[PDB]
Structures are given as C-alpha cells and as structure tokens.
Amino acid sequence: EAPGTGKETAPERREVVTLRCNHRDASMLGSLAYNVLLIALCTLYAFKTRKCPENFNEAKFIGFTMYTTCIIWLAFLPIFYVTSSDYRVQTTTMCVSVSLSGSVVLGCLFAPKLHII
Amino acid sequence: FTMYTTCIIWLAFLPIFYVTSSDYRVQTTTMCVSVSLSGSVVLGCLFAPKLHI
Amino acid sequence: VQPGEVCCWLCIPCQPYEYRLDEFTCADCGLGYWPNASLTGCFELPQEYIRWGDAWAVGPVTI
Amino acid sequence: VQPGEVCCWLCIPCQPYEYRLDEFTCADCGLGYWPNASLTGCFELPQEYIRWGDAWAVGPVTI
Known part of the structure; x- marks a missing residue:
C-alpha cells in the first residue's frame, strides 16, 4: 500500500492540521482481524481444555485471560x-x-506466579 | 468468579x-x-447457577 | 469588489482563509495554510501536534 | 446590496440562517433560531427524541 506518513490532513474547516500515516485508520483493522480469528480459535481451545487442574489449574487462568482479551477486543x-x-x-x-x-494478560496469567512468589 | 467477570466487564x-x-x-x-x-x-452473574439448573 | 461602474469599490472580506492575490480578485494559493504578517502569506503552517507538550495524553505515557 | 450607484443593486446570497428582511440587508434572529420564507418566523422548537421512535430508539427499547 504505502510506507505511511500522510502529512497535511485536509479537514472540513481548514484551521489546524494533523500528522498521520497513509491509511493506518481503516487498513489496520484487517491486520487486527488477522489476529482476532486467531484469538477466537485460541479461546475456543480455552473452552475445550478448560477442565484441566494441571500446573496449579493453569488452564482456567488461560481461559480467563482469553475471555478478558476477547471481550476487550x-x-x-x-x-x-x-x-x-x-x-x-x-x-x-x-x-x-x-x-x-x-x-x-500480565495480571491474569501471572497471577499464580505472583501468588507463589 | 462471576464478580470478577462483572468487574472486568465494568x-x-x-x-x-x-x-x-x-x-x-x-x-x-x-x-x-x-x-x-x-x-x-449482572443478570448473567446472578443467574449462572440458575442457568446451570 | 468592483461594481458596474469603475470609479468606486466596495470593501468586503471574501474569505478569511483565502490568499490575497489582487485588489479585485480573491483566490487561495494552496491548502491548509493561514495568511501571516509577511508579504507572501498563505503559508508557514507547521504540524499542529506538540511532542509530549499537552497534558491530555499523559495517561498512556504513565500506564 | 446597494452599490456605489443609487440606480440599481447587486444580488449576493448572505448567510442562510438570516430572515427575509428588506432590500438593504438580510436580518438575523440570533443564535439558535431558524426563519422561514412565509412570514420570517424563527421558532424552530422540535423535540429531542420521540418515545419509541424509528431512529436509534426501537432497538434500545426492545432490548
């Protein structure tokens, strides 16, 4: 597409200008989608392997991190x-x-690491 | 757990x-x-046991 | 602006963001500028985004 | 508008929110007003959002 740096953004009222990239507004969502489906399948596995008490019940923490990340996204x-x-x-x-x-992510997954010190 | 979920939703x-x-x-x-x-x-947080039954 | 007769003129501001070319015409030179006190005008407009100057985005920095 | 001549005038469209005044200059009602072309009536008192309206209300009230 472009390296970016789209300068002198033309507004409706020509009062101030703002520096921005070429098309970092609507194209980035595409890349975001490239991760979203990933996150999706990830949390899908988090729902499939949620009943695993191994590693101090680390599967539940993985699933909770996935839920929070999918909600915020x-x-x-x-x-x-x-x-x-x-x-x-x-x-x-x-x-x-x-x-x-x-x-x-740092607070939900590393919660047992902080608890056990 | 449901309270933590509601709090992160907030x-x-x-x-x-x-x-x-x-x-x-x-x-x-x-x-x-x-x-x-x-x-x-909040309804989900409260009725999770009701939804399970 | 010049009326039908050519011995008088009406002093009206066409546009505040338009380049002052002649005493009868009024048309902008470029785009995204403001006429300064210089003779040329309709230029000298840098980017309106200070680097860590505003206290409105300190939240991201501290987080 | 009246030019330097008293014979005739000049046709220039002024701001749209101005009322239908005489041939001297279009008059305004002030901030927060909108005149009409029937009798220069500037009231413009609509409602904010009708209850159960088809614009961003049906979905919310239904959910």
Whole structure:
C-alpha cells in the first residue's frame, strides 16, 4: 500500500492540521482481524481444555485471560472503527486498549506466579 | 468468579463510554444499550447457577 | 469588489482563509495554510501536534 | 446590496440562517433560531427524541 506518513490532513474547516500515516485508520483493522480469528480459535481451545487442574489449574487462568482479551477486543474494534475521524482521541483510546490488554494478560496469567512468589 | 467477570466487564465498558462520550448525539442513544448490556451482565452473574439448573 | 461602474469599490472580506492575490480578485494559493504578517502569506503552517507538550495524553505515557 | 450607484443593486446570497428582511440587508434572529420564507418566523422548537421512535430508539427499547 504505502510506507505511511500522510502529512497535511485536509479537514472540513481548514484551521489546524494533523500528522498521520497513509491509511493506518481503516487498513489496520484487517491486520487486527488477522489476529482476532486467531484469538477466537485460541479461546475456543480455552473452552475445550478448560477442565484441566494441571500446573496449579493453569488452564482456567488461560481461559480467563482469553475471555478478558476477547471481550476487550470485541469492545475495541467498533470503537476504533467509528472513531476514525479524530486523531488524538483515536490514538488515545487504541493506546488505552493496548495497555489494558497487556495489563490484563500480565495480571491474569501471572497471577499464580505472583501468588507463589 | 462471576464478580470478577462483572468487574472486568465494568473496566472494559468504562473506556468504551469514555471515548463514545464525544459527539453526544450518538451517546444519548448508546447510553440505553450500555445500561442494557450492564443489566444483562449482572443478570448473567446472578443467574449462572440458575442457568446451570 | 468592483461594481458596474469603475470609479468606486466596495470593501468586503471574501474569505478569511483565502490568499490575497489582487485588489479585485480573491483566490487561495494552496491548502491548509493561514495568511501571516509577511508579504507572501498563505503559508508557514507547521504540524499542529506538540511532542509530549499537552497534558491530555499523559495517561498512556504513565500506564 | 446597494452599490456605489443609487440606480440599481447587486444580488449576493448572505448567510442562510438570516430572515427575509428588506432590500438593504438580510436580518438575523440570533443564535439558535431558524426563519422561514412565509412570514420570517424563527421558532424552530422540535423535540429531542420521540418515545419509541424509528431512529436509534426501537432497538434500545426492545432490548
């Protein structure tokens, strides 16, 4: 498509400009989908192997992490899709979503690691 | 477990309305469906034993 | 603007975002600029995004 | 609008939210008003959202 860096975004009211990539607003969802189905099959296995008390019942923690990640992604995809007009707000919400996903992954899977110290 | 699920649902829905609060013309319409989804989440948390039986 | 007769003129602002070419015409030079105090004008408009200058995105940084 | 000549005038469309005034200049009702072409009536008092309306209401009330 393009390396990016689409400068001088033309707004309806020519007051201020904002720097952005070429088409990082609607094309990224495609790549996002490339992971979503993955996550899908992943949580599918998380539902298939949820009854496994092995590794201090690590299958339940895997399933919980999958549930939280799938919920936050199902909530983040339409938000990132409908907020493509604004730049600062869209970047802020996608950044908050990414940070929340990373934090819930580090807090749900590494919960027994922190508990046993 | 259901309380933790409801809490993470709250923590996931909070930024949704926090970012959808912009352009309140659609926020006044999404408030109803957000409250309905929250009520449905609480209903599931409460009736998981009722749904199993 | 020049009326039918060519001995008077009406002083009206055509557009605030339009380049000031002549005393009778009014047309923009480029796109996404503002006429500055210089003679050329309709230019000198950098990107409107400060690097870590606004306290509105400190949330992502601290998280 | 009246040019430097008193003989005739110049036809220029002003802002649309202005009322149907005389041939001097189109008059406005102020912020938050919309006149008509019948008697220059600027009331524009609609409702916010009708109960059980077909626009973003049927789905919510049904769910």
